[PDB]
Design a protein around this ligand. Structure first.
Ligand SMILES: *Cc1c(COP(=O)(O)O)cnc(C)c1O
Ligand SMILES: *Cc1c(COP(=O)(O)O)cnc(C)c1O
Lengths: 293, 293
């Protein structure tokens, strides 16, 4: 159609010109910050909602519920404003103003729990509400429609954009929808492709992702779809993030620096590798946090 | 050729779904925030530098100079990082720390003048430095390569995207490069097109543009290329800006709200008009100023 919805997905895939070893390997980055609301989350938000519409579970005017407050919140608030839904976002009351402003700007309703109840308290209340019938819960960590988005758009795009030359795919794992969906699609190809997931080192804090308890991975995660899982140190992610802006002109977030850091490790260890890493969002919303300056 | 440079331009053109009169008019918005560094300035930044390279005036490694601190500064810093130039941006010492960070992230060097000297003192210093042979001055307000970017990319895209249906073009004027270059291209078409330029009402403050002294328009400006100039009140631009996010899911800046406000006036006064307005940048860098949440 002719709406903002058609600008989601089909993000550019560009090759890094300067960082990276000179051993024949190539590093390409998928610019998810190009999505309308600035991040890879626009894909899963659209998919979770669109697929629910297709099942008759929801229709414009309905209330949507989710506990979150980062890109998923921004993305859901945007899809809600775009498609005509009432979005209710649950989060602890210690959110910066700017942080909640990104979600409120789209007209989403922010429902606060106590700092103490924290993110888990929010998850619970959101669930309480969906079971009472106060609105459809999206649940990004378990909703198969999340990876479905990447199985149908992101992965095919990457395969088409690298003309099937891709040998390694690198993704920082949050819900794991991106790595799960993209892997699912790549496995269907004859040519083998190594799937590399990244998680923060214990103690490291990288916005957008988290280190999952060994046996407490999100429901949509499928260990057999990931060939390797690497740890990325906060500092290493932040340095690569700043290096991307300075040496490539690519202004992205911390997890994106982490993804390229991982792609660098891979490229260095494998001459000739054709690595694709996901750049999750732009760096704009990180400016106030000082990671840049 | 596969670098971030190829993601500049070719921005989406989407139709507003809810705001606007129901009189047969259509309002389309050109999403310039989709440019790699988030603003319409990426086009002129790339053009001024590419064209100077063609003329042999500069080559990678050289110093580039410009007095500015908004989107132009950010766009120039980004092109410089992308292409390998040493960017120097001049501005008075009263820039917020976030405003400075948007330019420094790309490795640009900021050269400060006193608040007393202000933007005009910076313009002067920049000119002096270039005359002392310290670097190539870009001069966004007088450089023909600024409107040229719009004559060759922006205008042609709009004409193609609307399949020649456009009847009115609305643009908030800063350097006037966009309205100038787009008008030049549209005038070459058989079908007439009304060119509408917008400027802030006296006393109104709209980031990115300014009310030019009657007989002191920027050098690149050509009065005959613009059919009408409307005044936009700051409040009206801010309101339309907020309403775009809420009712359309389009998150953009103040001048963009002013642009859609102008397009609404045009649409309301002319049933059946096919209006195209330029959305200059995303709203992200405006959150900290409070104009939204
Ligand atoms: C969601 C997100 C990720 C991880 O993507 P998943 O598909 O959820 O694995 C990484 N970084 C940021 C900033 C994100 O918002
Ligand atoms: C520069 C700018 C404009 C004006 O565009 P011109 O092509 O310079 O007239 C409008 N809004 C914003 C935010 C700008 O950066």
């Amino acid at each position: 159609m002719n709406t903002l919805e058609q600008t989601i997905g089909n993000t550019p895939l560009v090759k890094l010109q300067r960082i990276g070893p000179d051993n024949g390997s190539e590093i390409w980055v998928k610019l998810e910050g190009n999505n309308p609301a600035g991040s890879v989350k626009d894909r899963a938000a659209l998919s979770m909602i669109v697929e629910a519409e297709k099942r008759g579970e929801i229709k414009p005017g309905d209330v949507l519920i989710e506990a979150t407050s980062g890109n998923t919140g921004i993305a859901l608030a945007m899809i809600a404003a775009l498609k005509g839904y009432r979005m209710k976002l649950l989060m602890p009351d210690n959110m910066s103003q700017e942080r909640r402003a990104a979600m409120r700007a789209y007209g989403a309703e922010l429902i606060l729990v106590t700092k103490e109840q924290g993110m888990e308290g929010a998850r619970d209340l959101a669930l309480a509400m969906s079971e009472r019938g106060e609105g459809k819960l999206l649940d990004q960590f378990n909703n198969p429609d999340n990876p479905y988005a990447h199985y149908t758009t992101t992965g095919p795009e990457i395969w088409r954009q690298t003309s099937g030359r891709i040998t390694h795919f690198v993704s920082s794992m949050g819900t794991t929808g991106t790595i799960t969906g993209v892997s699912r699609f790549l496995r269907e190809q004859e040519k083998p492709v190594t799937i590399v997931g990244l998680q923060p080192e214990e103690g490291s804090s990288i916005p957008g992702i988290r280190r999952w308890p060994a046996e407490y991975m999100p429901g949509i995660f499928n260990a057999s779809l990931v060939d390797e899982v690497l740890d990325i140190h906060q500092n290493d992610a932040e340095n690569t993030m700043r290096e991307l802006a300075v040496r490539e002109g690519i202004f992205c977030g911390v997890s994106s620096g982490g993804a390229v850091a991982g792609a660098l490790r891979v490229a260095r260890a494998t001459p000739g590798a054709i690595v694709v890493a996901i750049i999750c969002d732009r760096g704009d919303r990180y400016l106030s946090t000082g990671v840049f300056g």
